[PDB]
Amino acid sequence: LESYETLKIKLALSKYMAMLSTLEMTQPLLEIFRNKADTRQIAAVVFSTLAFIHNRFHPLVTNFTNKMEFVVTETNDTSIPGEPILFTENEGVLLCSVDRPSIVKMLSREFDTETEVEATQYLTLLLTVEHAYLHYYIFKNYGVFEYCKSLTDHSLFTN
Amino acid sequence: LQSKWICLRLNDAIIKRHVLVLSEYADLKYLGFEKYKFFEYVIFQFCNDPQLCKIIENNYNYCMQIFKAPADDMRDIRHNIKRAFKTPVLGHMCVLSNKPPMYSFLKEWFLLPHYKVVSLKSESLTWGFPHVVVFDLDSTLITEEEQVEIRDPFVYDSLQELHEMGCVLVLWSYGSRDHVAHSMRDVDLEGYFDIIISEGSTVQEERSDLVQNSHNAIVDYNLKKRFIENKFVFDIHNHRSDNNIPKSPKIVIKYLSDKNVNFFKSITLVDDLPTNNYAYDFYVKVKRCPTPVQDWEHYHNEIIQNIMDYEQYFIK
Structure with missing residues (x-):
């Protein structure tokens, strides 16, 4: 029973990795985020992953306003623990924050087991984007302080 | 009479999808300085005063909407407001504690104090905005016999199907709490x-x-x-020779908010006696079934069709 579910999960991972490879990034996944200057690759990666997740649970809508801009925050203060990715509002225009130091700490933490390590990093990044899209879904529908509340508690989605 | 009403919307509201019913437009003094921006939708009675219409038009910080209500029905209010504002989901409505309007449709309906709204949460165990539906116990899904029997085995499939859709499943009856709970167990x-x-x-x-x-x-x-206890006595709405089965929306809304439910797309009433349909948006007149009939397909497809009509009417 669970075997078919596991196959489907690994298939979702295969789509994830293949989509990332379609961005023509020969650099290792870790070294991509090591480059603080290569913000464009990070931003495009994140937007593509968000659109894919939205598509997976909402296949109807295919295109989204990517006008949201991505700034890689590197100040410890500006960083918000728990949510390395944040979406603000600037007079109707939403931005994005990226804690590259937190990402690097995430990528080099542990190697598990006892190639596949790529898969571990890929799954980690996917879950990061999972949080990102969950709270952004909250805002995109209705967020002013309810989005702030959802930041204070990401479990309101539960399922 | 075709009651005329005026509704206003704030372009930069602090919080979205909420209603505040005022006795008159000039009631902004109750909200006062910068404390009126909390709410989104404002509705009040129109006194057939074109000078008042000009006064309203002077307000460049809001939107203008005037319509007619042939009857003081909450349903018509919701329909007209949502159609004018194109919103697919309707939020909560508030009134003033000191000066609450005494409109008839307000009776037997849940009223939220204006200030208390700011201390709520959106958790509803839902992907998004769900619907609301409640079902009758006797002659609807449970046989009157001592041994409770399912009207249709497809009812359980229908329940999980609605769960896929996300509609909120509610049971309200009038029999003994203990007997009904044991019936649910059975x-x-x-x-x-x-x-x-x-x-x-x-x-x-x-x-x-x-x-x-x-x-x-x-x-x-x-x-x-x-096993909560209904600590509510609010059947005083209008004089009548005999009154019973109050089945008011107020109780349903209270128990919904118990789970932080504050944004429901639509609500439907599923019961046999039409008396329980006072101002419910959708009423399903279920045939009395003291014995199994296993014809839930028609009623289930009717539920789906009503939902589709709602969505097409307002979203599209």
């Missing part, structure tokens, strides 16, 4: 409904004795279901 409806209520005729037309602040619920944890 039919194995634990993992389907969200709120379980019975004995809805608690109204005694209370007018004096100043009895309040007395809550005591014996939640038998044999099933851990919420």
